[model samples]
Target chain A: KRERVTVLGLGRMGAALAGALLAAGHPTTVWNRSAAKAGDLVARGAVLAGTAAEAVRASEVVVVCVTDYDVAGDLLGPLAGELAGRALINLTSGSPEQARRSADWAAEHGIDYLDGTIMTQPQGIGQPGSVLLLSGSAEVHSGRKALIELWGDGDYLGADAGLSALYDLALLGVMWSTIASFLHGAALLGTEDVTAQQFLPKVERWLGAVASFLPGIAAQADSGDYATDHGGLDINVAGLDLLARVSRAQGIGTDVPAALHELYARRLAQGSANDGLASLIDTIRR
Target chain B: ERVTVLGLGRMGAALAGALLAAGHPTTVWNRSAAKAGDLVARGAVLAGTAAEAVRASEVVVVCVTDYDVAGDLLGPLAGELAGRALINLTSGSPEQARRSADWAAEHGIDYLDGTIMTQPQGIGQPGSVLLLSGSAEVHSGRKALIELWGDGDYLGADAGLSALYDLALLGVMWSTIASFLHGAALLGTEDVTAQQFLPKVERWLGAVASFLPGIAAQADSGDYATDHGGLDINVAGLDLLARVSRAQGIGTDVPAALHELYARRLAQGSANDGLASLIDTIRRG
Candidate 1:
């Protein structure tokens, strides 16, 4: 039998979340603050709830996708008493502390809370490539694996309730930095009418190769050893300067490369010139 | 199969050792004669001056500290380099490469400029990337010698493309690693080991790399239609990252730059546009 599901919020991502469950043959009910936003799902065999509280009453599995923890608090706090014995998986974006606080609030109300962060766009929901990470009771997560997998691959980090948010922010930072690096390079190469499409393949391969070094880098940070004959800190300082200089020479903004140069220079001055590139993790780490 | 190597820095010595291993009849010269001992013991013919090495072979490889030093050793000896193919693997700017190419032209020398995308120990390691770019086909007869060093990628005949790619690729490394380390620092405050986060980061980077195709398309078309996540959402995520970084008592150096960059993009009307829209802001003067 298909488990009844409730999605509270009809924003773009909320709609996608509800629509994925609906497509997966879950008897899905959706609620939005404005009734007009529920029409499309209503036409597609979804039961529309006039109030979010009524929606929670309809399904044992309630997925809350909202703008932030503040909105999440506003909507879910009032219905906390009504949510007894139900599993509430939150897909709202929030800080790790906010996530833990929500989970704490859920515990006080006899509700099982799972804080989740979706690591993809709205269109990525239901795609196998998308990741939806959650942190809460391990036993509660195991019971709802199928329903959760309907949205995407579901990973249970632990019972900490904050690990998902913590991982999300760090992963987001890496993606942004990598993309900015490519944009900087594209701007440099674009000076010669070379499209990013032309260089994108090579860049991808290069990044893939560089990623192999991450394990060693991380290991060095965890341990106290940073010795390496390749990719020393001072050489990287020099490399960063070259990139900044070259960006300026290409008439593009040097802000990104220049900022990185300034950051790495301190590690070089710390006498880590002969250490691996990952040695800076030691410097960056408290 | 005679090849002459000029300069004897750590990188230069590695190149000479590889040439010697490949049985290229390698001749090497350095300013300080003592730097040649190790290579000399390994059957390398060491010359005292640039002139002696320049005449030893029609194929010459120069891996020096900079273009200035390359010029100092080669500028006065174009007469000796005439008709000889010069492979300049020194790291320098695109303009510098063009200037050197002109200098080679004046001396009737064939010239190719390249950047080695590896460290000292990686010099001849199989599959190592050595990008060669010149305004002319200066490596056709010397291809075997170049590939012996690594993959021997020829970027084109631009003479400066190799240097541009060199700086661009290295920029990628600095930016990516710094952000990852900052993330490590952030995790440390939470009592998380960076080693445990490594595999996840690599997998996520793989996913992020898949995003480049869509980004490249947007950068080329110049149309800002976004079918997926908005930069607006990314801006929110950045705020979360900054807050967490600060609350954890770790440095927020990584998030600040990224936040400033993303915030700038959103203010430029990319609020609903995809992250690739930032590509436009990067190219703006």
Candidate 2:
């Protein structure tokens, strides 16, 4: 059930990958610029290679979890002949364009390439909930699906190598927005002497409810239909205005509320007053 | 044994509708009487006046435009509501809720201040949340009846905590939706439709949601030490986000707002602290 795997770059994430492989009974080979970081994995029965080329030649599947696309490219370019006809799975972080270029370079050198993004920390490796998003040729993904699932849940996101990186940035955007919004609420309530502890249970429950609305919202977005008997854009604009005023009076920064107020006001003015919040997509889309 | 619902606005109508649909004997009232027609057709008794509605049942719910409107309708009828369970679902400030609680106590009425945490259409639906506060006795007595509307969460005897919770939770929702739209705008510049981008957003939101309790705990404990990532690193990432949004020709409103908060935290020398450090800046401001 195990395949020979070479993990390049023994950073925290790279070491975790090699550890999972070794734990799964695979013949795991590892290489890092500095050998000292490979100690843990090496003690766990991994073979620490002396050079990047030796590591590339040691296994059929070469997984690179280095700093970025540029560093990965610079490190792997000279060893292209050794990597030819082998599988190169990039778990590095980079822009979509960078991923596309690397995939192009891999194809030129007759190497099978799959771009991937890991949606978990090193400690979470091999857990069922850990998500690993991969994109490449359908055939390449199918051939490696069994090997990939050893790290976590593997999602094959079609043939474009750039999709993984694109989705990474998009997901990160959502994360930033959520945390910022949450902190704003905490700040608002803190003005009334309510600690975030007192405010948290209610927020947790409310976020659960908000999570249920996403599917309907996504459907409405896809259909371009914002019809609803619920509170409309007009009401949201009014509510946001109240929030902004309250924030100002409470002496907290009005950044969060005011920015949303401006956006909702514009959508209401654009004749979607009776439309639901999903219609705000149009304002942004244009 | 009937439950009376005063004010036939959309939310009030929904509350009355859910009660009647659940086969509870319901009495409904509104100033114009026109808004009550649908509920009236659905086996609800139409009360001719606010006083009549209060007199019709032992339990009365008021979900009108605001506290002022609620006060105007109920003040003269305090005698009618005496010794009865009166739940105010009107949207109002915590101060207003506290004042209403005092007025109700003076009239010998068992009062509970509540805020419906969903749209009218969301009433009676699974996951719907309604916050209730004041009079633990009244809340426990009417617990079964209250839960007929949704998940009736009792927030203890403060009377004003429900309104505070409502404001804070609503603020969270608005900021989240706005940020979603901003990201949708950013991706749209690259020809990524919201439909295609939605699943990714939802999944990411789920991950982010899991982090809230820890964040709250950090804010409570006043400890911002983090092994995950520090505030300085996050602020740098936000700077990149802002730069990218501007380059994509979409409004950087969401990122810019968050950046200011994080920047303030950095200036406070919280560069090595976790994201919870931003709350200190927000608390001081």
Candidate 3:
């Protein structure tokens, strides 16, 4: 049995989502603020809803992919009172707090709210590569499992409506810090004839070798032991000094890493040496 | 096969002594005149005048501590010293090359200005990495004479010019250190050992690994696809991480810039774009 799916946006991702839904043979209804954007999807056997409320009323599962909470609220806020008996999945980019509040509002209006964080692009939808994180009721997620799986991998984080957004934000922090680190490497090697191509192989190899140690670090983080089985903080400090001197001698900027090393040395000197290196968690919390 | 060594400084003496031990005919000289005492018994012939030292060998290798000494000892006294191959294995910044080149022209000296980056202890050793940036022909012409001291990394000659080439690699070394140290400090608050901590640090750092190719592709194609992952996701993540860092009491500057990118990206309405799209923000704004 095919389910009715209504897509409220016809932007690139919206169109891609609608395309995937139609290809899956879902009875899909398409709508957009600029009605002309829905032409392509309408031609692909999608029913065009006359208005936002009609779109919400047209399907059992309604996916909201708008610009932000403001636009999302403007379009769906009024329809909230009418969505009491339907499932509203918000794939709109929003914060945990915003998501939590939105869920509360939706619940007051009688809607089944599931906040989702999309971890892939539009093209990646309908494939195993894209990861979609859902946070709400296990019952809600399990009931809609078949439909959500068509989008990509689905992770059920809990019934908190805000947890998936929080995890999405956390994963992003990991992504950017990694990018900044790579840029530093690029700027450094750009000083030599070693372009990113020549330097990346070595960097990639080092990162792969280092990736295997995450479990141990996580264990230490949990156990509270930051001991250096192979070397001491003092040795690491010396290495930092060598790096600073060498960097200065080569005329490269030292502000970024120098600041980081200084913070570590300061914390270590404050009598936190015996704690697991993960103990920096406390220092950072301060 | 007799080699004349000028300047009895730490590096100079090491090179001179290594030459004597290698059983080469070695002559040594010093401006202070008394500094050659240590190498005298190492079978080194002492020369009283700079001219005598220059005339005493087929190839003259000079290793002084600074650019000023190299100028005062060789450029001022040795006049019209043509036909002799002179390799100035000195330690000086890139600015010293032009002056040395002028001096070389005045004396009609076939000069190859070289920079010895290794410590004094590394002289005459196989593992010692030396950089030579001068005319390839001159280096090749005197390859036999130079090989006795260290592994000569020949950066093709523009005459008195390889020091700048050496600076490039030095830049990479320092930047790596700074990044590693910064990460160590961030992890330190978590009680992470940099030695034990770096491996895990490297793993989560795969965001960079993934970005390198993405940015390179963007750089080559000049296209920023707001596709894949956008600033909204990044901003959301950075904000939470920043909150985590702040809640944990860690310094916020590094993570602050990270979060700032998301804020800025969203503010500019590029929230639906990829993270490397920030390069445009960095370059344009």
Candidate 4:
């Protein structure tokens, strides 16, 4: 038997959350400040609660997918009395400190709380590759995981209330950096009149090959043993030099290449010339 | 089968070693004779001269410092290279690769212009990818011997395609790793060790990798419609990244440049378009 779950805020994400719960056979209760937002959700067998307090009272597990922590606070604070001893999972996007503050408030109100960040779009809500990164009390997470997994993969990162937001920001930073570089390379190829579509297959293959090297790179970072018989920082610095020169020759901006070149060069200056490319992490670490 | 490798530089030695490991009758030559000692001990024939090496095998591979060095070393041995498959694994420009192909064609030498996608140690290692372009017939003829070194990816008849791909792929590697390290560094300021942050970075990268096919398709069609918020959103994120990076005492070199690019795209009235619209900014050059 599926557990009863209440979703507060029927925005795109909130509706997706409520829809997934219904799809997974959970008795889903949904609420939105504006009643019209819950129509389709209600059509999908979701019970629409007219008030946030009524929604909180409808189920032991209450999931909030509001726009931000401030809005979440506004909606949840008044219902705190009704939410006591129940599980409250906050999937709002906000800073780590905001997540911690919410967890603290929930604790003060006698509510078992979990702070989470959904790492995918609304379309990915119930899909296999989607994930909801959560961090808070492990006991509360384990107790609610069966209901949570219906939303996506629910990954628990121990007992730190702020860890999920911390991870979200850090991961987004990586996404920005990677996409920025891909744009640079696509530009470089576009100079030769090669459409990105024409070049995409090779990009995919090359990225797959590059992805294979991450394990070793990560191992070097973890162990601080950056020695290698393979290509190292010296060769990489030279390679980046070629990339920059080619970007300029192609009349594209050399910003991405130049930035990496400077980092590798700085590492070379530190006498890590013979060390693995992972050694460049030292320059960044400073 | 007999195979000869000209140039005993680190990479040449490794190539020759791989040939030897595959039980080919391998001959090797180098400008410096001392570099061939290890290969000789491992059952390779160390040729006294480049001409002698070229004469020893029907499958001859040349991997040297540059195209000029390769031309100088092999130009006079054109007669010997004729009627043999000459695989130029040298690093060079696409122009140089095509020129070498031209020269080989004139001299009746079967030629394949190729590039190694991995370091010397990765030679012959499983998962090592070697890009070959030009003369698929030649590649097909010696497929077994070449496959001994790494997985041989044939990119078709254009002699310069392999070099083009090699540089383009290297650009991806250099830029992606730099960004990953930069992120690790940013996380480091908050006392998250690179070691501690490594797992999250790896997992996040894998997730991001899944977005490439969609991105490539959008770039191809020039229609960047998205349910995800557009370039303006990303520009804002980049601003926050640069600000946080600056406040954290690390270089914002990565984020700053990216900010300029995305902001440029936004200012050009692509505020509602997907991030792939930045491909227009890149291609505008």
As a whole number from 0 to 100, the lDDT of residue B94 in candidate 3 is 53
TM-score of each: 0.95, 0.91, 0.61, 0.91
Better of 3 and 4 by TM-score: 4
Summing lDDT over every window of 10 consecutive residues in candidate 3 chain B, give the lowest-scoring window: B170-179
Selected candidate, larger lDDT, 1 vs 2: 1
Q: Residue by residue across A101-160, what tens digits does model 2's lDDT show?
A: 999999999999999988777888898767888988676688878888889988787787
Error of 2 at B126 (Å): 3.1
Of 2 and 3, the candidate ranking higher by lDDT: 2
lDDT of 3 by residue, B62-122 (tens): 8876778788777655662576777788866555765776677677677787876455776
Q: What is the TM-score of chain B alone in each candidate?
A: 0.96, 0.96, 0.71, 0.96
Question: Mind sharing the TM-score for model 3?
Answer: 0.61
lDDT accuracy of residue A96 in candidate 3: 63
Ten-residue region with minimum lDDT total, candidate 4 chain B: B225-234
Listing every candidate in turn, what is its Cα RMSD in Å to the true structure after a full C-alpha superposition? 2.1, 2.7, 9.7, 2.8
Tens-digit per-residue lDDT, B1-285, candidate 4: 998999989889999999998789999899999999999998999888889998889989999999999988899999988899999999987778989999999999989999998888889898788889888988998999899889898977878778877777887787677677677677666667666777676666677888877787787788887634678666776776676666657877677767777788777665788888777776554
Candidate 1 Cα misplacement greater than 4 A, ranges = A270-276, A282-286, B32-42
Better of 1 and 3 by lDDT: 1
Give lDDT tens digits, candidate 1, residues B201-277: 87788789888898888878887666446787777778778878889787777788888887888887856788788
The lDDT values for all models are: 0.85, 0.81, 0.65, 0.81
How far residue B222's Cα lies from its native spot in candidate 1, in Å, is 1.1
Task: Give me the runs in candidate 3 sitting further than 4 Å from their true place.
Answer: A237-245, A274-276, B1-211, B219-254, B260-285
Model 1 residue A122 lDDT score: 85
Per-residue C-alpha lDDT of model 3 across residues A150-232, encoded as one tens digit per residue:
88878786788876665554454455555544544444444554444554554454454334444554555455677755324
